[PDB]
Design a protein around this motif. Structure first.
Motif, PDB file in Angstrom:
ATOM      1  N   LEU A 185      -1.351  10.217  -5.174  1.00 43.62           N
ATOM      2  CA  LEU A 185      -1.861   9.001  -5.850  1.00 43.62           C
ATOM      3  C   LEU A 185      -1.816   7.867  -4.837  1.00 43.62           C
ATOM      4  O   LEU A 185      -0.982   7.863  -3.923  1.00 43.62           O
ATOM      5  CB  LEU A 185      -1.073   8.696  -7.112  1.00 43.62           C
ATOM      6  CG  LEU A 185       0.433   8.492  -7.012  1.00 43.62           C
ATOM      7  CD1 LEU A 185       0.779   7.063  -6.722  1.00 43.62           C
ATOM      8  CD2 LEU A 185       1.121   8.906  -8.334  1.00 43.62           C
ATOM      9  N   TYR A 186      -2.765   6.945  -4.970  1.00 51.08           N
ATOM     10  CA  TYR A 186      -2.947   5.848  -4.032  1.00 51.08           C
ATOM     11  C   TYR A 186      -2.843   4.529  -4.782  1.00 51.08           C
ATOM     12  O   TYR A 186      -3.552   4.304  -5.764  1.00 51.08           O
ATOM     13  CB  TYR A 186      -4.306   5.983  -3.334  1.00 51.08           C
ATOM     14  CG  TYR A 186      -4.548   4.884  -2.339  1.00 51.08           C
ATOM     15  CD1 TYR A 186      -3.809   4.811  -1.167  1.00 51.08           C
ATOM     16  CD2 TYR A 186      -5.465   3.893  -2.577  1.00 51.08           C
ATOM     17  CE1 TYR A 186      -3.999   3.758  -0.251  1.00 51.08           C
ATOM     18  CE2 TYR A 186      -5.666   2.857  -1.672  1.00 51.08           C
ATOM     19  CZ  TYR A 186      -4.923   2.790  -0.522  1.00 51.08           C
ATOM     20  OH  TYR A 186      -5.116   1.757   0.395  1.00 51.08           O
ATOM     21  N   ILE A 187      -1.962   3.667  -4.299  1.00 48.55           N
ATOM     22  CA  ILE A 187      -1.659   2.357  -4.873  1.00 48.55           C
ATOM     23  C   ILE A 187      -1.963   1.306  -3.806  1.00 48.55           C
ATOM     24  O   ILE A 187      -1.476   1.413  -2.676  1.00 48.55           O
ATOM     25  CB  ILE A 187      -0.160   2.292  -5.253  1.00 48.55           C
ATOM     26  CG1 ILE A 187       0.220   3.358  -6.289  1.00 48.55           C
ATOM     27  CG2 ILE A 187       0.228   0.867  -5.675  1.00 48.55           C
ATOM     28  CD1 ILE A 187       1.732   3.585  -6.365  1.00 48.55           C
ATOM     29  N   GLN A 188      -2.708   0.262  -4.170  1.00 48.89           N
ATOM     30  CA  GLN A 188      -3.008  -0.827  -3.240  1.00 48.89           C
ATOM     31  C   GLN A 188      -3.003  -2.146  -3.997  1.00 48.89           C
ATOM     32  O   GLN A 188      -3.779  -2.327  -4.943  1.00 48.89           O
ATOM     33  CB  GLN A 188      -4.364  -0.608  -2.571  1.00 48.89           C
ATOM     34  CG  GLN A 188      -4.816  -1.740  -1.662  1.00 48.89           C
ATOM     35  CD  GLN A 188      -6.158  -1.461  -1.012  1.00 48.89           C
ATOM     36  OE1 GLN A 188      -6.367  -0.422  -0.377  1.00 48.89           O
ATOM     37  NE2 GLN A 188      -7.098  -2.367  -1.222  1.00 48.89           N
ATOM     38  N   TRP A 189      -2.148  -3.066  -3.551  1.00 48.78           N
ATOM     39  CA  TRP A 189      -2.073  -4.421  -4.092  1.00 48.78           C
ATOM     40  C   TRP A 189      -2.246  -5.363  -2.906  1.00 48.78           C
ATOM     41  O   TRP A 189      -1.347  -5.489  -2.066  1.00 48.78           O
ATOM     42  CB  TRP A 189      -0.753  -4.698  -4.817  1.00 48.78           C
ATOM     43  CG  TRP A 189      -0.375  -3.651  -5.811  1.00 48.78           C
ATOM     44  CD1 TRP A 189       0.687  -2.831  -5.737  1.00 48.78           C
ATOM     45  CD2 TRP A 189      -1.082  -3.289  -7.004  1.00 48.78           C
ATOM     46  NE1 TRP A 189       0.704  -1.983  -6.803  1.00 48.78           N
ATOM     47  CE2 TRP A 189      -0.370  -2.255  -7.600  1.00 48.78           C
ATOM     48  CE3 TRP A 189      -2.235  -3.761  -7.633  1.00 48.78           C
ATOM     49  CZ2 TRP A 189      -0.783  -1.658  -8.781  1.00 48.78           C
ATOM     50  CZ3 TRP A 189      -2.628  -3.178  -8.818  1.00 48.78           C
ATOM     51  CH2 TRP A 189      -1.907  -2.149  -9.375  1.00 48.78           C
ATOM     52  N   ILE A 232       0.856  -1.174   0.000  1.00 49.44           N
ATOM     53  CA  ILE A 232       0.000   0.000   0.000  1.00 49.44           C
ATOM     54  C   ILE A 232       0.896   1.229   0.000  1.00 49.44           C
ATOM     55  O   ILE A 232       1.828   1.325   0.803  1.00 49.44           O
ATOM     56  CB  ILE A 232      -0.962   0.011   1.212  1.00 49.44           C
ATOM     57  CG1 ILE A 232      -1.860  -1.231   1.183  1.00 49.44           C
ATOM     58  CG2 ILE A 232      -1.781   1.300   1.194  1.00 49.44           C
ATOM     59  CD1 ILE A 232      -2.734  -1.364   2.409  1.00 49.44           C
ATOM     60  N   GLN A 233       0.550   2.210  -0.825  1.00 45.46           N
ATOM     61  CA  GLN A 233       1.296   3.457  -0.835  1.00 45.46           C
ATOM     62  C   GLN A 233       0.366   4.615  -1.139  1.00 45.46           C
ATOM     63  O   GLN A 233      -0.334   4.616  -2.155  1.00 45.46           O
ATOM     64  CB  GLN A 233       2.414   3.405  -1.861  1.00 45.46           C
ATOM     65  CG  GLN A 233       3.207   4.676  -1.909  1.00 45.46           C
ATOM     66  CD  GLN A 233       4.472   4.532  -2.679  1.00 45.46           C
ATOM     67  OE1 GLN A 233       4.633   3.621  -3.495  1.00 45.46           O
ATOM     68  NE2 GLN A 233       5.385   5.437  -2.439  1.00 45.46           N
ATOM     69  N   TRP A 234       0.408   5.620  -0.277  1.00 44.23           N
ATOM     70  CA  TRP A 234      -0.269   6.881  -0.519  1.00 44.23           C
ATOM     71  C   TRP A 234       0.852   7.896  -0.723  1.00 44.23           C
ATOM     72  O   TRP A 234       1.545   8.282   0.231  1.00 44.23           O
ATOM     73  CB  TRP A 234      -1.185   7.254   0.623  1.00 44.23           C
ATOM     74  CG  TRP A 234      -2.146   8.330   0.254  1.00 44.23           C
ATOM     75  CD1 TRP A 234      -2.410   8.820  -1.001  1.00 44.23           C
ATOM     76  CD2 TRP A 234      -3.027   9.008   1.144  1.00 44.23           C
ATOM     77  NE1 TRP A 234      -3.406   9.766  -0.929  1.00 44.23           N
ATOM     78  CE2 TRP A 234      -3.785   9.907   0.382  1.00 44.23           C
ATOM     79  CE3 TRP A 234      -3.249   8.944   2.527  1.00 44.23           C
ATOM     80  CZ2 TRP A 234      -4.752  10.730   0.943  1.00 44.23           C
ATOM     81  CZ3 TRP A 234      -4.213   9.771   3.081  1.00 44.23           C
ATOM     82  CH2 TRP A 234      -4.946  10.649   2.293  1.00 44.23           C
ATOM     83  N   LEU A 235       1.060   8.269  -1.980  1.00 41.62           N
ATOM     84  CA  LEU A 235       2.160   9.117  -2.380  1.00 41.62           C
ATOM     85  C   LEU A 235       1.705  10.544  -2.513  1.00 41.62           C
ATOM     86  O   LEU A 235       0.723  10.817  -3.279  1.00 41.62           O
ATOM     87  CB  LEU A 235       2.660   8.650  -3.740  1.00 41.62           C
ATOM     88  CG  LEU A 235       3.863   9.389  -4.283  1.00 41.62           C
ATOM     89  CD1 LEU A 235       5.144   8.890  -3.638  1.00 41.62           C
ATOM     90  CD2 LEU A 235       3.912   9.230  -5.800  1.00 41.62           C
TER      91      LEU A 235
END
Lengths: 6, 6
Positions: free
Chosen positions: B1-5, A3-6
């Motif tokens: 930006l939000y990334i979720q795997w 998970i990343q909130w950049l």
């Protein structure tokens, strides 16, 4: 799990 | 930006 909130 | 795997 990755998970990343950049 | 939000990334979720689950």
């Amino acid at each position: 799990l990755y998970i990343q909130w950049l």
